[PDB]
Write a protein that holds these residues in place. Structure first.
Motif, PDB file in Angstrom:
ATOM      1  N   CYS A  82      69.579  33.142  43.627  1.00  0.00           N
ATOM      2  CA  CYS A  82      69.142  33.797  44.854  1.00  0.00           C
ATOM      3  C   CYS A  82      70.006  33.312  46.027  1.00  0.00           C
ATOM      4  O   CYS A  82      70.684  32.276  45.943  1.00  0.00           O
ATOM      5  N   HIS A  85      69.527  29.399  47.207  1.00  0.00           N
ATOM      6  CA  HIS A  85      70.156  28.332  46.420  1.00  0.00           C
ATOM      7  C   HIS A  85      71.664  28.475  46.366  1.00  0.00           C
ATOM      8  O   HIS A  85      72.367  27.465  46.222  1.00  0.00           O
ATOM      9  N   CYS A 146      68.290  28.294  39.427  1.00  0.00           N
ATOM     10  CA  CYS A 146      67.260  28.919  40.235  1.00  0.00           C
ATOM     11  C   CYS A 146      65.942  28.893  39.481  1.00  0.00           C
ATOM     12  O   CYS A 146      65.912  28.783  38.249  1.00  0.00           O
ATOM     13  N   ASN A 147      64.846  28.968  40.231  1.00  0.00           N
ATOM     14  CA  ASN A 147      63.565  29.169  39.583  1.00  0.00           C
ATOM     15  C   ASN A 147      63.425  30.621  39.190  1.00  0.00           C
ATOM     16  O   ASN A 147      63.923  31.526  39.866  1.00  0.00           O
ATOM     17  N   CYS A 150      62.122  32.712  41.989  1.00  0.00           N
ATOM     18  CA  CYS A 150      62.850  32.823  43.246  1.00  0.00           C
ATOM     19  C   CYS A 150      62.868  34.240  43.756  1.00  0.00           C
ATOM     20  O   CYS A 150      63.330  35.132  43.069  1.00  0.00           O
TER      21      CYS A 150
END
Ligand SMILES: [Zn+2]
Ligand SMILES: [Zn+2]
Ligand SMILES: [Zn+2]
Ligand SMILES: [Zn+2]
Lengths: 199, 202, 201, 201
Positions: A82, A85, A146-147, A150
DNA sequence: CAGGCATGCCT
DNA sequence: AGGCATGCCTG
DNA sequence: CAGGCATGCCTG
DNA sequence: CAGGCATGCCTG
């Protein structure tokens, strides 16, 4: 290949992807659920993955890791970090890896990061190394930047991780895929997922 | 060759390579104790720690044994194990030492001990050639010293380590490998007692 | 100039006052104010009306500056700016005279100037002072806040204060009022929750 | 060589006061101040806001120097530095302006001057004196303390006093204040423990 | 040489 | 906040 | 480390 | 529009 295949293919060298025994802790760095064929891990932590081959593949053979979204509705989108990040200073000062790739390799100078001119796909490749004497597996250290949750990136959309055994030209020798979920509290999100896999 | 992730997978090899420890004092703050229940070595900083080398068949010429530390937990496996800045530039156990101050492991009483600094991996190891066991001793005894506590901030910082002992030839082809957990602390008997009681509750 | 902007209240020669009208009690109301906690609750990019009152007209060329700053001392030195996600987004950005990084916007006033201080980096928005319309009691300024207080990469759940400064052409401070700011999606919820925890043990 | 700077409490002409704001009661709060002991508790590298009040504006070039010295007589001859671990470490040392070896740093001010006294060996950080802003009471300075008080290789559990000195461009001392400093991991626990014991004795 | 403390860090 | 980890003092 | 709160967003 | 959830992140 606008949509890369995720079909299991052991191939001429019997490529197998396995995970070591992990922590059951609620927020362990990573855990694997064999039942769900689902990897859990935290952002930017070291994920060790285990490959196996019966007979070694040809000189110049290599391992590729590409993320792809699970749902058919979102498969056509390239998976990247994203904006937050990508532009943020965390894990970006002095890194060879492009700030945009979801997947990085840890502990390998010979990692090459591929940006496909045709498909746009991002993936990270390392030359194959045979297991060291006495060892059974070769271990690639993977990081996920990333999560899964996100916003602006994966945006709570599940993905699958495609590991591909390729020949120096590009010829696939084998392929394994598993579900990947980057979250803060892996132990928790695994137990929740399995308790709800009762159905 | 150069390896960035040194594997700690036990491998006896054709020479049945075995690494054992003699009887240790159970005293709280003893210089070293070994827990075979846990395959964990407890020792004090800069004290003499005997290691036992054993093989069923004499190994080839030019064979050596290499001793390198690695962090046990994968989250830190990539970090090269070195000394903390305090002890590296300290005044203790560094005055006139053929050893680089930066190495954690040293060999005691062997003038054939060379210290490697693999410039590709940046890893630090200690190599001594394979001397047989002394006549009437059944094993080769190697004196190791560890110059930085497990808890030292700036270096290990409370991160467990493994000590990989590797039996290899003059070029570096590994013939055999044993690993064990290492903890460089101050009250090795207490901390072995604590760990062992914990593993015993389950 | 001043790297740590002051937030202390200062009525000054003109008794500079900053008030909020009556707000809805809805869970997802566009904005609500808590006079008990001196906190404002607002939604991302929603019109938030602030009311300005002075006893005696200030001199000409006077202005109103709105600047945000973090409340806790461990963060005060960081400039408060939009998160990367909102900044680079197409939303509220193309076809707008506000810089995409400024957090505070002024709605409905093309005389507003967005300031990036070259020495301190602080971002603010300034409007010329206007006396209330005839017969009106306060000068109302329509503000917009462009990030949720929790936006990762920007405010990141760090509390801010919004600082309304009455100042002249040169910048001399004629007055100052401040209040805690919280951008969120359910202002009624989060207000009732903070007012409930105000009566704790 | 030897300096042994004075910590005698001396307000001087402009009525130099050094005070603290309301801090948290949490065990692991970032910082807290016990007026009872004239003792500042804080965490390592965290933002410690210092409040400075005066009466008359000092001459120009007047600046404020924070210098640390050891409390117990047997140690005051020793210079208060950073332990070799934190000094040579990477933490809080990448991309900054302060020498790695100082204890005390100023956060949020590029005019700060770190001094390495070629005679006295003493290390200190000097900021110019700026007056409070329009409407505020004090001039807030933001201090970081780089080591814990318990760091072996450095302070080594020895208590220290921090000397805040208002001083002229020539170096003439216009006022001085002091208080104990403790850099610990749990300022609330240790302050609560410190006040309790004193009260019981 | 073991008892036990102060204090960082984990729980 | 409660309590444990752990270097180091002490007798 | 496990518990539960903090919050954006869904849902009906 | 209020209830409830999913998930990052404190709390004790
Ligand atoms: Zn992201
Ligand atoms: Zn050390
Ligand atoms: Zn935002
Ligand atoms: Zn220190």
């Amino acid at each position: 290949e606008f949509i890369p295949s995720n079909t299991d293919y052991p191939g001429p060298h019997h490529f197998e992807v396995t995970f070591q025994q992990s922590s059951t802790a609620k927020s362990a760095t990573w855990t694997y659920s064999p039942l769900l064929k689902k990897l859990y891990c935290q952002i930017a932590k070291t994920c060790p993955i285990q490959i196996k081959v019966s007979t070694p593949p040809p000189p110049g053979t290599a391992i590729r890791a590409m993320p792809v979204y699970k749902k058919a509705e979102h498969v056509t989108d390239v998976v990247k970090r994203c904006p937050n990040h990508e532009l943020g200073r965390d894990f970006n000062e002095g890194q060879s890896a492009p700030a945009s790739h979801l997947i990085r390799v840890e502990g390998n100078n010979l990692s090459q990061y591929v940006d496909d001119p045709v498909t746009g796909r991002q993936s990270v490749v390392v030359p194959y190394e045979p297991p060291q004497v006495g060892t059974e597996f070769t271990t690639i250290l993977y990081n996920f930047m990333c999560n899964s949750s996100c916003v602006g990136g994966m945006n709570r959309r599940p993905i699958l991780i495609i590991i591909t055994l390729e020949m120096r030209d590009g010829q696939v020798l084998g392929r394994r895929s598993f579900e990947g979920r980057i979250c803060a509290c892996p132990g928790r999100d695994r137990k929740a997922d399995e308790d709800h896999y009762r159905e």
